[PDB]
RNA sequence: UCGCCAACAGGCGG
RNA sequence: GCCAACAGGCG
RNA sequence: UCGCCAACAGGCGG
RNA sequence: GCCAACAGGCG
């Protein structure tokens, strides 16, 4: 068994799908990267640790690049015009059972489900109103 | 129009659904809370701000409580045995178009989609392996 | 739900009723006003916040115009001679369930029911005796 | 006449009705309490004073207790788990006629009528939106 | 109802129309923006406050951008060559009835009607004479 | 050209129209007023200047009389209770061509078109909600 | 709260 | 960068 | 007399 | 608690 596999980060239909694959797992930090120029790749990292006697903390990070071609001195390189950075921390007490955790996940999925406040606001360069 | 409405945070079928409703929107921080004892309620907050000249930062927070009844001196109160805390920060450059933002959202949704590494690990009190 | 709708503030039996409607939502503070100049309007505002660790506090304010000998749409000075202000502050411990809160509301309705001491005193420009 | 009479604070349909009765008028503060131990009683107080040279102010307070039986030192005592506090102040100009005042009373009654926004939000442990 | 709706800021006859939509209400400042990158968007904001004891002030702002594509560090980014800023403040006495206010709105509309002096001068890059 | 001519400020459909006419040109500042006492008149002033090296600024001011319960030709005090003031400041970068300026004007007309948020709010003595 | 200026919900002088 | 009782605390 | 907070006819800042 | 070029920086 293994959950350190490749997965679809962005489901753009069934073609423009962005897939990330395991690239490194050093010092307790799992890292996935999309194919082609690392300079223009999507990045995802995840790590867990006992933040305290009663808490376990997950630290997840995602990088979404804006693909672009930089030309300097007639020399063009594939780069990222800029990057959007997602940084989330999830703290779960050691008393949480699997059911409790399943719930926490559902909460996260609902928070970002299509149509809900937060995702709608983000997807539209907007805030809450 | 308004996106500061109530929504389903947890989709437990069509019955045990956890819904959060707008409760307060002070100092640029939108806050939703589930019904009944505030002591045992789910909490969600969201806020946006220009973190820098080129970046806009979203700060989202979710609290998942473990419902329990505390009895002290024969007096019982509805409380939360403990709480799981989710804290995420999303940084998006001002050059991002709506399409760019739609993508970012998709990335977030995919990261937590059922079956993928991160959600599976969390839902099982596990890390990456 | 979605409670921010217009409602009848003063019920005079269908004819001569005073309806108050949404006029503002800045800072999460809900506001309703009658179809009058701001100086002669009926105003209602409401807001909720966690006033402390154990309490939540609702702040309700109402402004009622002096109608006897009033000149509709005119300039009436001094303002203090033509207006009554009601300030309500409801503190509810975070342990209060929905049921508990229903009771609290009832208590408030009972306090002001027609024929009871308080409303009777007020309506008669008197105190208790 | 005399308006210092007992009244039903909480109408539960004849059964489980909370009634408060005159209990004190010391220092010009009219007081009513439910037929309970001073520690578990519902409390209503009211007072009027000529605040300014042209204003009269009514100060009304209501205390809704959450009855419980606590065990202190191995002995059982009737107590209140917590209390909900309603504090309201009403300022009326001396130029207000009785009709002017009836208007105020009506507005307060309408403000809390079943089905209206404010009472709905309170009873639902939520804000207005 | 709810007046926080999207509207057409620039009417170009159905084709090339600039529309702005609600994007934020944080800190009591209603905001609308065009479906663009935050860097090239049209922006409209509005707020009301009780300036004096007898005045209400509306503060409206509109930003008209001159879209362009700049090359920074060999990379192309969506930017605004420059922006035109409209800042307007409207102070209305609390004694103004709704009809009084409609008068104001009409005057503002007439002030900028096609063919009238002011809009003519502005559109011609000239003064009045 | 020669734009300094009279025009209809408030269009009430031919009958009851408010026309404003040239009344002063001192210091290049154009002024228009309705046929009223200066205290009850409709006033409009406009002027342009190079506010900075890159910008030109138009300053438009409008004064609208409170009409409800007004006494034509009478002395109405305090002035602040009977008048509304509109101050507009339009900043236009020196690069703006005539075409650009036409667009800016359109944006201004759209902002105040009948049925849109801003004018609707103002006309109703309300804010955004 | 008045006068200015701006890169525009900000800055300077009153 | 970390911690938390989580719109808060320390480097 | 205005803004807060409370264990609520009391406390803090104006 | 914040910022970022983001498994990093300052209180």
From Swiss-Prot, chains A, B, C, D, E, F:
Changing residue 78 to A: No effect on the organization of the T=3 capsid, but with a loss of thermal stability. Complete loss of infectivity. It holds the Pfam family Levi_coat. It is found in: Virion. One of its GO terms (cellular component) is T=3 icosahedral viral capsid. Its main location: virion. SUPFAM superfamilies: RNA bacteriophage capsid protein. GO terms for molecular function: identical protein binding; RNA binding; structural molecule activity. Changing residue 76 to A: No effect on the organization of the T=3 capsid, but with a loss of thermal stability. No effect on infectivity. The keyword RNA-binding applies. Signal peptide: none annotated. Keywords: Capsid protein, RNA-binding, T=3 icosahedral capsid protein, Translation regulation, Virion. Residues 31-104 are annotated as: Viral RNA-binding. GO terms for biological process: negative regulation of viral translation; regulation of translation. Disulfide bonds: none annotated. Homodimer. The capsid proteins form dimers that assemble by group of 5. Twelve such pentamers are linked together with free dimers. The homodimers binds to the viral RNA via an operator hairpin, but also to many other RNA sequences in the viral genome; this interaction probably shifts the virus from the replicative to the assembly phase and ensures specific encapsidation of the viral genome. Belongs to the Leviviricetes capsid protein family. Capsid protein self-assembles to form an icosahedral capsid with a T=3 symmetry, about 26 nm in diameter, and consisting of 89 capsid proteins dimers (178 capsid proteins). Involved in viral genome encapsidation through the interaction between a capsid protein dimer and the multiple packaging signals present in the RNA genome. The capsid also contains 1 copy of the A2 maturation protein. Acts as a translational repressor of viral replicase synthesis late in infection. This latter function is the result of capsid protein interaction with an RNA hairpin which contains the replicase ribosome-binding site. This is Capsid protein. It comes from Escherichia phage MS2 (Bacteriophage MS2).
């Amino acid at each position: 068994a293994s959950n350190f596999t490749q997965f679809v980060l962005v489901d753009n239909g069934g073609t423009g799908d962005v897939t990330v694959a395991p690239s490194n797992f050093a010092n307790g930090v799992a890292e996935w990267i999309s194919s082609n120029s690392r300079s223009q790749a999507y990045k995802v990292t995840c790590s867990v640790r006992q933040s305290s006697a009663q808490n376990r903390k997950y630290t997840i990070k995602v990088e979404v690049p804006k693909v672009a071609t930089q030309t300097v001195g007639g020399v063009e390189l594939p780069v990222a015009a800029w990057r959007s950075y997602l940084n989330m921390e999830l703290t779960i007490p050691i008393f949480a059972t699997n059911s409790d955790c399943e719930l926490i996940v559902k909460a996260m999925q609902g928070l970002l489900k299509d149509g809900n406040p937060i995702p709608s606001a983000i997807a539209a360069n907007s805030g809450i109103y």
